[PDB]
Amino acid sequence: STGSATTTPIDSLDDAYITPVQIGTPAQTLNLDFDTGSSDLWVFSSETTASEVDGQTIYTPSKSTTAKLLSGATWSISYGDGSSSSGDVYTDTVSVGGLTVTGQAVESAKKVSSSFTEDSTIDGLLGLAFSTLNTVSPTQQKTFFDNAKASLDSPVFTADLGYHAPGTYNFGFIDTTAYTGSITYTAVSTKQGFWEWTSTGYAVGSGTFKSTSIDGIADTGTTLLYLPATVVSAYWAQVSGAKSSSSVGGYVFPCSATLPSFTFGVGSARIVIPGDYIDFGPISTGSSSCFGGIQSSAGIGINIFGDVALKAAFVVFNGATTPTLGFASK
Ligand SMILES: CC[C@H](C)[C@H](NC(=O)[C@@H](NC[C@H](O)[C@@H](N)CC(C)C)C(C)C)C(=O)N[C@@H](Cc1ccccc1)C(=O)OC
8 A cells, every 4th residue: 555645834934844644533634743753643632731722623532433542551752842742542543645554543632832832733743753762651652654564565655845835745655756866775773763874974055075974863853954063164154144143042144145055965975955945034023134944963962854954855764674764856
């Protein structure tokens, strides 16, 4: 079986992308944030504190005849952004783009963070990291991908984010129609449960490529590109006016300024993010400072290949036994 669904950004800066998902019987469609750096399927619901639901579509486990309590089961997550979600757990049929997974663990929030509450467009998250990270206790659960896998034609899913536009999530197959040239597969370390890979270097605009191993995760759940202090300085050094700021907490640039492109190496191949991808617009409305898309990783612990970077390539998450990450130009 395969499934394809349309992902659409939720705002003009493509701060995140949202995918329609059918949960329940009959079907309740929620828009979830597909998160390849998290292992939890969670959604706003019928139990969620009514002080923390503001415009989101809710999943009503009451109205699904396929829905049952996982009695005793419970979840809690912390995100890198400082996001916090928690509640009870149910088992339900979940369909994504016609790929139906029966008996999927759907994590019903009782409690959600400010961050999620101030976010009207997103109805929950669908984790597509490795199952080791799934939060649910006392009996830990598998992801939707983990559930789909053997049912799939191929144990893979592709990610094809658009820049100011829809893109696509495909499960079970590779559209040879969606990229240009060759896909370069690179080795994945599963050990921390991430889609965890090592980049072969970087170039700043038309400058000379530096060969240097940047260990990082592909995470479609992270908006920007997070890279070592060193790498980040070399980039912003090329934009007049760019400064790192105490108060704003990150690199900014005069919005009148011009972003050189950024190039990252996947093996022998190279991926250009156009400079336009790294403009995240003014820090506050009216401001002539604009916020950059490539930020230091120094304060997080890990380099994140976020949307900024992934949305410049056609990515393939090979969920094989010997998991492999594929990148191609599009
Ligand atoms: C179930 C745990 C998952 C794996 C959780 N994952 C994450 O935080 C990863 N991304 C989290 C999400 O992709 C988030 N950026 C998307 C939005 C919509 C919520 C980071 C590491 C790249 C994590 O490691 N959380 C850390 C907290 C943390 C992580 C990174 C940096 C700082 C602090 C924890 O404590 O485990 C609960």
